[PDB]
Amino acid sequence: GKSHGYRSRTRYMFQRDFRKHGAVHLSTYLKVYKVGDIVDIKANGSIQKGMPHKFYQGKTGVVYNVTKSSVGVIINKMVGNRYLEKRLNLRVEHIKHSKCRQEFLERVKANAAKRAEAKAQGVAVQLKRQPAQPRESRIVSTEGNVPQTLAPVPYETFI
Amino acid sequence: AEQVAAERAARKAANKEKRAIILERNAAYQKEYETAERNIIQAKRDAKAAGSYYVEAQHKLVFVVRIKGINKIPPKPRKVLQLLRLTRINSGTFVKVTKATLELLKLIEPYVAYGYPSYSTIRQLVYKRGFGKINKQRVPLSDNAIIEANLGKYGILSIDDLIHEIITVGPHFKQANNFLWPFKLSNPSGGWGVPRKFKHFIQGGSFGNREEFINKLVKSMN
Amino acid sequence: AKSKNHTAHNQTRKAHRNGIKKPKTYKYPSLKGVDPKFRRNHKHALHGTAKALAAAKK
Amino acid sequence: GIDHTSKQHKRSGHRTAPKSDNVYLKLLVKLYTFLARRTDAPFNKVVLKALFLSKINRPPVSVSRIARALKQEGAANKTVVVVGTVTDDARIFEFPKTTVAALRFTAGARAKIVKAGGECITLDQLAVRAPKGQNTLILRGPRNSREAVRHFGMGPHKGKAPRILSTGRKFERARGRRRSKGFKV
Amino acid sequence: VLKKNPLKNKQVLLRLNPYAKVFAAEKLGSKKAEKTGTKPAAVFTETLKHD
Amino acid sequence: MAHFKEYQVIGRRLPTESVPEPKLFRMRIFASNEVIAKSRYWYFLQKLHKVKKASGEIVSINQINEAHPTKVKNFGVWVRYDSRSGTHNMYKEIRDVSRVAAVETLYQDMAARHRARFRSIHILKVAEIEKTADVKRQYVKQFLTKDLKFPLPHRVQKSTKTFSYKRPSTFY
RNA sequence: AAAUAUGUAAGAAGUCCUUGUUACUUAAUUGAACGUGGACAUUUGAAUGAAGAGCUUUUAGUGGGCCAUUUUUGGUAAGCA
RNA sequence: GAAUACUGCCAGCUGGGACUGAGGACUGCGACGUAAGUCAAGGAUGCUGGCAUAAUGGUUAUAUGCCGCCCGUCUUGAAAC
């Protein structure tokens, strides 16, 4: 009855991005991947080789190996009562870098710079970012902002 | 020979000056609180005089109490209750309000009653139901020696300094509140009003944010 | 009498009872799926640097 | 009623007293649990936690491991400690005249040490001499090197030596192990 | 061995918080507030009474 | 809901760089608490203006007391409500002493006749009518006659005792 | 193109600066990976909580399920599947 | 120019009633007092009276009020027609 082939229930995910069909950028082939980088997996329907399984679409992981036209990715797959470690081998068309890695990196850079400046200045390094604090007091004026008395409206059809 | 009189007298001379500095700290805290309320009163009056509207600053502190029992709680609210330390009906804690907590509060809303407490309730509640968590062992406070011992490394020497750190939500609030055991409150003495409890406060129920009417509920049930 | 195929009820309960858990990442991880062209040269780099540390120690 | 998250009324899982009923062992336990209570040294706590163990977890330590221990930098004139048993090694031909403290000594080990000029003392005498671990060096033997650990974790692609009485061909050298007889593990 | 609460048992209320003695001396809960004779604005009153 | 009060509530749609100093809307609300008052405020203001309390700011809430609570008045009351088939507007007239007691009588009358609860009622306008001879209701303008007078035959006395010895009367 | 759910990250295993190995790579000490010595000296890099975390061994019973709320398929509908 | 309501505070005063008295030399934190010492301050003491008896308590039968379906078992489910 049920069929569970390698490309089952993927009518839509390997589709291509309306009015961006066809060939691919070469920025993807020009991108450089080292070991330890963080990469988000997104498949491509044009390229049949190096294709990941449908489970790994949208996931992200670290890279552990590099080859002529592909990279070795690590992923942590949930199965049962444990997380197993899967090792993918993916061509570069099905992958991209992660931006949270770069923004965390430049945050660390800002932290090093601010710690240097705070060592030059003295006290109040203050690097830990806190959540949205509650607001504080203030005074609202009525100059040109006189309060208008609203009221709920009746019922009408205007169908 | 006996070699006890000098040590005893030295002990008394030391704890005497501890008592002194505690006294002169509490006095300053009292002046601080009364000045703080008087100034916002005069501010709300001065804005009316000017033909304006002085808004009040948002509250920093939320006392929250559990309302629903133990049975038939979904997992994510159950975990949030465990994280706020509400393992039991009619248990209560304090909370430093922020974006990270208000989401938990709207998530846990149909199982708690939370609100903005007052200095009077904090005092009247800590003095009666004051227990501390140290090797855990849930010790009653009953003395400032415990607090000197287990929070001297944050300047907290006394129970008054503790309630100060709680009200003026200070840097050491996490440590102080986690040192506090969760408060094991009773049921309300004059009832809840409201014969059906598990509706929102606004629809004629109990749960959710009663903003300042929490100080009545806790003073009843404590 | 039929034969009920399956029911996913209670399986997540069994999982979260013993606590679905992470694989305990390690320092210096495995090196089996890696390029042998890289591994073979890493080996002799380590040979040479061990020799050089021994020379500098003496 | 209260919400629980872990198991209540659980045992700690650690042994807090020896399973034996040997009198001298109980006396040593009494001594070292006085000490660990009243001297704030980690050595005594480690010692009683070693005394509580079982025979597979206090293995024998060779007389030659002690020598390569003493070959360490600075550990030439330290007092060696073993909560267990020492055993002779004919593979070594030289030995220093150190002081060794343990609770069971083989005759070969005793003879070797005293022939080198050493000392074969007990933990009692050790506590009299160094009551809180002064210039001590503890040694432990290998746990996982025994035979029953070969079989633990037996499964495909594991290399964990199946439980078997008779060996050779005709005894688990076939399908599941050959590339020809179907598959290999 | 037994918890005597403050808010009764003045002995415990004085073991804790010695400021309670002076708090009762000046009594500091029936504290009077000085008179201030401010007055709100016609804009405020109009916005209040306006329908 | 309860024994009622009246509040004014003010809301802001707190500022940004696009629109600093916004237009500061106001509403007159009947409710028993500040909490319910501002909840209803955000309800109506969300229905009308593009705002919710996640993007707003209550700058003021003030209770309102009756100007002349010892003087009897007549209030015209425009409302809407939702029935089991649709929703309808309605006008009533209430002879009462206070703007809030009129509202209590209104909610009770609506629950009695139309079986409309609090959740399905909106008060569009409460307004005292100043002059007479503009009432539109017999049940109000019959109380405005010169030298009004009436009995209540056969009032009932809720006596405290259980055994009486008197076979009592009902004279007013 | 939502809502709910969903992956990763929020450091000291890191950041910056000298200098060493390679049989790999590069036109090229050029790069890659691994190291060497200093500084950044645990405000050492969101919130909350922790009835401590982790690792093994061995073994029982079970391997007929059912009800309710929401989303549902087949069905006239069913205390139906 | 007032009081009165409503809300809130007093480490504000004063009464009435019910339940409990754990522990067993001292050690401590405190308060009053110049002092001596005293204390409602790390768990109750004092005074007075009655009973030689069934006073109290226990066991058993009976009466009364309320509750209480026959055990074991297969079962998703047994008081089971």
DSSP C1-56: --------TTHHHHHHHS--------SS---SSS-HHHHHHHHHHHHHHHHHHHHH
| Pair D62, D87: CB distance under 8 Å | yes
Amino acid at B137: Q
CA dihedral sign of residues A80, A86, A92, A97: positive
> E36 to chain B: which residues are within 8 Å by CB?
42, 45
The alpha carbons of chain A give a radius of gyration, in whole angstroms, of: 26
Q: At how many Å resolution was this determined? A: 3.2
> Which chain F residues are Cβ-neighbours of E48 within 8 angstroms?
8, 62, 64
Pick among B42, B44, B48, B53 to test the A interface (most A CBs inside 10 A): B53
Torsions phi, psi for F78 (to 5 deg): -100, 130
Q: Which of A19, A82, A97, A15 is nearest to A54 (CA)?
A: A15
Task: Tell me whether residue B212 is exposed, middle or buried, using C-beta atoms within 10 angstroms of its C-beta: 0 to 12, 13 to 18, 19 or more.
Answer: middle
Classify residue F79: in a domain, yes or no. yes
Angle between helices B99-108 and B75-83 (to 10 degrees): 130
Of B105, B106, B67, B86, nearest to B196 (Cα)? Answer: B67
First to last CA, chain C: 82
Q: Which two tokens stand for residue F99?
A: 């703007």
Query: What kind of experiment solved this structure?
Result: cryo-EM
D6 is near strand G: CB distance < 7 Å: yes
Buried-state track A70-106, b at ≥16 Cβ within 10 A, e below 16 = bbbbbbeeeeeebbeebebebbbbbbbbeeeeeeeee
Hey, what are D143's tokens?
């746990």
E22 touches strand H (CB under 7 A): no
Same domain, F56 and F77: no
Could you say which of F23, F45, F122 has the minimum Cβ distance to residue A145? F23
The alpha carbon of residue A154 is apart from the nearest alpha carbon of chain E, in Å, by 17
F113 and F61 in a common domain:
no
By the 8 A CB rule, do C16 and A82 touch?
A: no
Question: Which has the closest alpha carbon to B156: B135, B127, B177?
Answer: B177
Tokens 């629980």 sit on residue:
D4
**DSSP class of F62:** E
Do the bridges between strand A95-97 and strand A38-41 make them parallel or antiparallel, or are there none, so unpaired? antiparallel
- CB pairs A-F closer than 8 Å: 52
> A126: which strand partners?
none
User: In terms of domains, do F65 and F93 share one?
Assistant: no
Q: What is the dihedral of CA D169, D175, D178, D179, to 10 degrees?
A: 160
Crossing angle of helices B144-151 and B5-50, rounded to 10°: 80
Same domain? For F52 and F79 the reply is no
Q: Distances in Å between the alpha carbon of B158 and those of B17, D11, E16, E18?
A: 13, 38, 8, 11
- F94 and F81 within one domain: yes
Task: Choose among D154, D166, D127: nearest CA to D44.
Answer: D127
Q: Which residues of B touch E42 (CB under 8 A)?
A: 51
Residues F62 and F33 in one domain: yes
**Which residue, chain included where needed, has tokens 């329908």?**
E51
Q: Are residues F21 and F62 in the same domain?
A: yes
Residue type, F155: R
Shared domain for F54 and F80, answered yes or no, is no
Last residue of a domain, one of F69, F84, F113: F69
Task: Classify B63 as helix, strand or coil.
Answer: strand
Q: How far is CA D91 from CA A135, B105, D50, D62, in A?
A: 78, 71, 28, 10
E46 touches chain A (CB under 8 A): no
Residue ranges and CATH numbers for the domains of chain D are 14-145 (3.100.10.10)
D4 CA to H42 C1', in Å? 34
**Position D95, amino acid:** F
The two three-digit tokens of residue D160, written as one number = 């964990």
Domain that holds residue F64: 3-69
**CA distance readout (Å), D148 to A17, D61, D177, F11:** 59, 18, 22, 77
Are B209 and F35 a contacting pair at CB < 8 A?
yes
Q: Are residues F112 and F129 in the same domain?
A: yes
Domain boundary residue, one of F36, F69, F102: F69
Chain H positions with an atom below 7 A of a protein C-beta are 8-12, 22-23, 28-32, 40-43
Q: Are the C-beta atoms of A45 and A15 separated by less than 8 Å?
A: yes
Note whether A131 contacts B: Cβ–Cβ < 8 A. yes
In this structure, the answer to whether residues F116 and F75 fall within a common structural domain is yes
Chain Cα centroid distance, residue A126: 27
> Is residue A9 within 8 Å of residue A54, measured between CB atoms?
yes
> What is the CATH number for F42?
3.10.20.10
Q: Pick from A73, A71, A72: which is nearest to A92 by CA?
A: A71
Our measurement of the distance from residue B2's CA atom to the centroid of its chain's CA atoms, rounded to an integer in Å, reads 46
Q: Cβ distance B113 to B206 under 8 Å? A: yes
Confirm whether F128 is domain-assigned: yes
Chain F contacts of B209, Cβ < 8 Å?
Answer: 35
B123 touches strand H (CB under 7 A): yes
Got the DSSP string for A77-111?
A: EEETTEEEEEEEEEEGGGEEE-HHHHHHHHHHHHH
> What is residue A56's DSSP assignment?
G
Geometric angle at alpha carbon A78, from D156 and A42, rounded to 5°: 110
Which uninterrupted H or E stretch holds B64? Answer: strand B61-66
Residue A50: count of CB within 10 angstroms of its CB: 18
B103 and chain E: CB distance < 8 Å anywhere?
no
For B142, counting Cβ atoms within 10 Å of its Cβ (0-12 exposed, 13-18 middle, 19+ buried), the class is buried
For residues D162 and D179, what is the distance between their CA atoms, to the nearest angstrom?
19
**Lookup: tokens for F155:** 């009032």
Q: Residue B147: count other Cβ atoms within 10 Å of its Cβ.
A: 21
C-beta of residue D159 within 8 angstroms of C-beta of residue D170? no
Evaluate whether residue F9 is within a structural domain: yes
Alpha-carbon distance of B116 to B106, in angstroms, equals 15
Task: Give bridge partners of residue F92 from the DSSP assignment.
Answer: F77
Note whether B171 contacts A: Cβ–Cβ < 8 A.
no
Residues F102 and F59 in one domain: no
Say which of A142, A148, A154 has its CB closest to residue F89. A154
**Which residue has the least CA–C1' distance to nucleotide G16?**
A112
- How many domains does one find in chain F? 2
Candidates A131, A136, A137; nearest CB to B100? A131
Q: How many Å does it take to go from CA E31 to C1' H50?
A: 58
Query: Which one-letter DSSP state was computed for residue D64?
Result: H
Helices (runs of H) and strands (runs of E) counted in chain B: 8, 8
Domain contains F132: yes
Residues of chain C with Cβ-Cβ distance to A64 below 8 Å are: 29, 33-34
Q: Are D108 and D88 in contact (CB under 8 A)?
A: yes
Whether residue D181 contacts residue D175, with contact meaning beta carbons closer than 8 Å, is answered with: yes
CA–CA distance, A89 with A52 (Å, rounded to integer): 8
CA distances from D165 to D157, D162, D173, D174 (A): 22, 10, 14, 16
Residue F170 lies in a domain: no
- F64 and F74 within one domain: no
Which residue is associated with the tokens 């199982």? B111
Q: Kindly determine whether the C-beta of residue C42 is less than 7 Å away from any atom of nucleic acid strand G.
A: yes
Q: Please enumerate in sequence order all residues whose Cβ is within 8 A of that of B217, keeping only pairs 6 or more positions apart, or say none.
A: B65, B113, B115, B188, B192, B210
Strands (E), F115-160: 121-128
Nearest to A153 by CA among F75, F129, F78, F8: F78
Residue F38 lies in a domain: yes
Q: Is B122 exposed, middle or buried (0-12, 13-18, 19+ CB in 10 A)?
A: buried
**Would the CA dihedral through A45, A48, A52, A53 be positive or negative?**
positive
The number of beta carbons lying within 10 Å of the beta carbon of residue A61 is 22
For residue A159, how many other CB atoms are within 10 A of its CB? Answer: 3
Picking from B68, B70, B79, B91 by the largest number of D CB atoms within 10 A of its own CB, the best residue to mutate is B70
Q: Is residue F100 part of a domain?
A: yes
Bridge-partner residues for D86, per DSSP?
Answer: D61, D105
> Measured in whole angstroms, how far is the alpha carbon of residue F160 from the centre of its chain?
35
One-letter amino acid of A39: V
> Do chain E and F touch: 3 or more Cβ pairs under 8 angstroms?
yes
| F158: in domain | no
CA distance A103 to A93: 23
Q: How open is the CA angle C18-C23-C29, to the nearest 5 degrees?
A: 160
| Cβ pair B51:A142 closer than 8 A | yes
Give per-residue burial for F64-75: e unless 16+ CB within 10 Å, then b. Answer: beeeeeeeebbb
Last residue of a domain, one of F54, F69, F84: F69
Cβ distance of E44 and B159 shorter than 8 Å: no
* Separation of alpha carbons F75 and F6, rounded Å: 15
DSSP SS3 for D128: helix
Long-range pairs, F37-40, Cβ under 8 A, ≥24: F37/F7, F37/F9, F37/F61, F38/F9, F39/B202
CB A60 within 8 A of CB A17: no
